[PDB]
Design a protein around this ligand. Sequence first.
Ligand code: NW4
Length: 150
Amino acid sequence: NQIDLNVTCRYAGVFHVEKNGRYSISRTEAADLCQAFNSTLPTMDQMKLALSKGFETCRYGFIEGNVVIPRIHPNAICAANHTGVYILVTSNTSHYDTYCFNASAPPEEDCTSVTDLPNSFDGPVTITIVNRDGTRYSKKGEYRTHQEDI
Ligand SMILES: O=C(CCC1CCCCC1)N1CCOCC1
């Protein structure tokens, strides 16, 4: 009973979270997952400020109201070579990664590692935070509040 959560740098408090190395989070699970990091789904304004500070990924993830990819450098295989906060318009499917926003993070680029899952609740799952540099933090708990996500 294990969940891997790959996390990034925080940019103006915004960061990316990928679950189990594949697109696998529903919108309900995404809000619960950010709450476990004492965080919320970013607003579009919060995401645009994060982009302006250096944030980009090559993965679709939820924000409040949309599924997006923040892009700085054009790349043909990331958001069809677009720049800016690219918004997914047409998809058949419902599961993506998520973005999260923590208001207490530093104002600009924070590329230190994540060393805690501060607001997870009691549960049976071994949850492992995996940083880009490979460092890990594990703790037993749960974050999902909706049965359909378990
Ligand atoms: O776990 C924590 C805080 C513990 C430490 C405290 C300083 C920042 C690095 C790690 N967070 C989860 C998601 O990003 C914002 C905060």
